[PDB]
């Protein structure tokens, strides 16, 4: 309150009470005036056209929204090391969003000379969509989230939603949410904003890789008293059918009776990082899994949590089945393979079928050798199962969350769903933390002396600045495994190199070299 | 450092067509370590428009013409030791 | 609080309660924006290369840190006179650091015209490293400390640490401390900062020279009933060995039995101020004591507290064994001998071996004149002891602190150490007063209308100003010697001269002519 | 990838015996990375019962006979780039 008094102190510490990790964070935000304070609608008809698949119809609201659903907004890589190394899961528990220390600045352009003097009177609006009655757009890893390195000052991304679209034309159901129609809160350089949010009961995330393959869950020393069919012909010859069973023991663990079967599968195309082995044709789009509701295709990216590759095939990775984050300084499009870092998932090859493999096989006809009056001599033929739905007793493991990976994602308000764990990884919440849309109010320049009924399109250019602080207390589940072989941990290699990992370059650009998973500890099935 | 033991089964088979399709299992390849690959090559066969070259453990055969067949399963382990055992297939 | 209200009054007095000397001090600070608000790393690879010895790898943090560990920040030379003349020691007892009256100013450069208008909204961050979890860089007499003359307005030095470096390349252990990752405090032109710090129990400093040479500690009137070996041959001739003892009295005080022996020694090279006597070769680097851990040399500067020269040899001084402060107006490098003032240490020649001398001699073989079956006729040969480690009952005196000399220095957090008195002089504290790192927050100029995910490298140039006040209460140990000969004191010579000592020149530059020790009073051993 | 800068000091020296012992510092070897080794070789000298071969940064000389000397300091960095600068020593 008042110009000469800071409205809130810069908290950025990361306390570790024990079974609670309060991870405050603060970055400086700069927010321009988007769309000249208008609500221009967007369609591919305006963006120059697009394919049938890429058609969209939505509105370009002038509000900027603070997004912080990426793990590296809060966790310094050292904290992320302390949380993956020794912990068996975590989940957010609360939130606290202090928006303080606004200063609105007026930009004047005379003869191409930029003079920036602040407005001690202009106001910037803030409000939280606390009933989710707006189209939730947090939850696709949209690149506008808070700066990985605290000092980094970031530009607040623009808020624009999409609605129904028959081609590029709206339909009757196409909704148009006017943001100002919501009760805002006006801050005018001496005020601060704060809402506390309580995370709902979201299940503990799996921060552990399984040290017991789901198909080697048995005892390797005792038979299993469940005989399996072993032979069907006594020997090579004519008319020598028989039916010989045998016990399923440790000598033959393939045919062993099992209580549980690996999780779902939706086969992905296989592409190998060694560019020589891939076929010499453009199979980027044609030949990748897609689900295609309403007649328009869309890549099954990243799809159901599936292991990237079979043990020993490191070079491979599914076409559209892994998050592929871009390293700092990479181009927007058509970058080479080495400038983008790929998240491999070998960590759940135990209880998930391999993404590029075909989940077993199912017999397709009857092995009735000699039939009565309709003889076919049909041998038992087997067909593969490229895609398999969830059956009785099937277990699986959800996808991993990386340091550069999303936290939450609103569960679409639908009449039903199954295991709402957002496929990109994270937590599925019916009531995620709300959006915080911020807009700096228009202030018309100089209306005419004579009346005029138009919308007064001449506003004076201005922007804002301040700080934003997101304290989000996690809850841990400490590990108490009686394992004797030393655990596997995440470390930074001790070897001389030009730059320290996760540390600034000579120019000052903060570089994250590799994605950090959260499955390092081991817990038996 | 035991070399792999390649055991192809069944060794001998008598099949009479409209069921030429026959499979001989080769997955019974005993070794200490993982069998890195399986190699199948047919040494003798009646002249056919195609020649059997595959790497699958369970060899799939289709469109078999009358005659005598002799297939050879070659296995390689991690170290590199190879053991080759031959399979004889006969069609009436 | 508020723009039109000073946030703290200028205290600069120096109270003398009696056995307590509260020495407040205040100077005006100006702090630019270092490194354009980045964390550029520094190495000799970037600084143009260096020798094997000078390689380093560290980060150039944009924070400025207030440093006040020099005695003349607090003590006006008159107070320093009142504290050396009649006092037998002192030690800091408390601290009080009020940072008040910030004003942030914005610099605009249009057509090369500097227009400076203040920002009533921009904020400057302050925080104290109150757990020493940052690399302590106070404690090498780094030239950025508070202005000797109160009026002097000073620029706050930049904070940049060093870590491990295999050459100029970091290793795995090389740590990267991000300063913003600490809970700051934001002051925005109407706020003030204040922390009180309690000095730990640091031993009283020795403000006295010993008036009894350690080798003349006896009674010059009585023998000592401990016979010493005096003669070994009766007279010049063949085969005239004998063994004659005699009493060690006052006639021969050299061989007198003594309880205690002088302190350690690490011989330094001798260089004479009369430039004619020094040898005609460049022995600056080659031929000076160095300790050289990890394969890289480094001068033993200033090394263990050792007396500079034997009584009467004033012109000499050890090569690398004395603090050599530069007088005001001196060049950065390659200055002549008269423009730098050398601190001689003749004040502890009593209980410390001379720096340029070789601490006695130790016999190296057995004086067995005629041996049985292995005859050598080996005379008793003696070898010198250039460097001697601490033995049982050895006493010594730590180095002096000068007016232009450091106060404290963090004791490195190691598993063990011996007599942690920083060799440059001062007090060794396991928990010294913390650093106070101050940074003025970035405020991005004008981000684009379209979104862009970069670090927003365009900030508006600005700096800060205010005052800083350091009240640091010392504790004295008054002197009660029954000496009858008048004590020796520190005075300013009564003789007409162009300028008063410790007083400003015609141009206004404050000139300190000579270093002032703190060992003037005399206390018997 | 800057090559090392070999700076031997002092460059020129005049010494008259019973103090033949002279040291010329070679530790002033500028480079980005560590100087892996120093090499000293004397190109010209009056005939002596010994020949100067050493790897120390600070070269130690003893028993110098009258004449003219030209020593060569060769430095190598981590990468392998070598820069050689010569030093001239003269004894009266």
Swiss-Prot record, chains B, D:
Modification after translation: N-glycosylated.
Q: Where in the cell is it found?
A: Cytoplasmic granule membrane; Golgi apparatus membrane; Golgi apparatus, trans-Golgi network membrane; Cell membrane
Positions of the PKD domain: 5-92
Q: In which tissues is it expressed?
A: Expressed in cortical neurons in the brain cortex (at protein level).
Self-association state and partner proteins as the record states: Interacts with RTN4R. (Microbial infection) Interacts with AAV-2 VP1.
Function field: Possible role in axon guidance through interaction with RTN4R. (Microbial infection) Acts as a receptor for adeno-associated virus and is involved in adeno-associated virus infection through endocytosis system.
Q: Which named protein is this?
A: Dyslexia-associated protein KIAA0319-like protein
What is the species of this protein? Homo sapiens (Human)
Q: Fragment boundaries within the full protein?
A: 405 to 496 of 1049
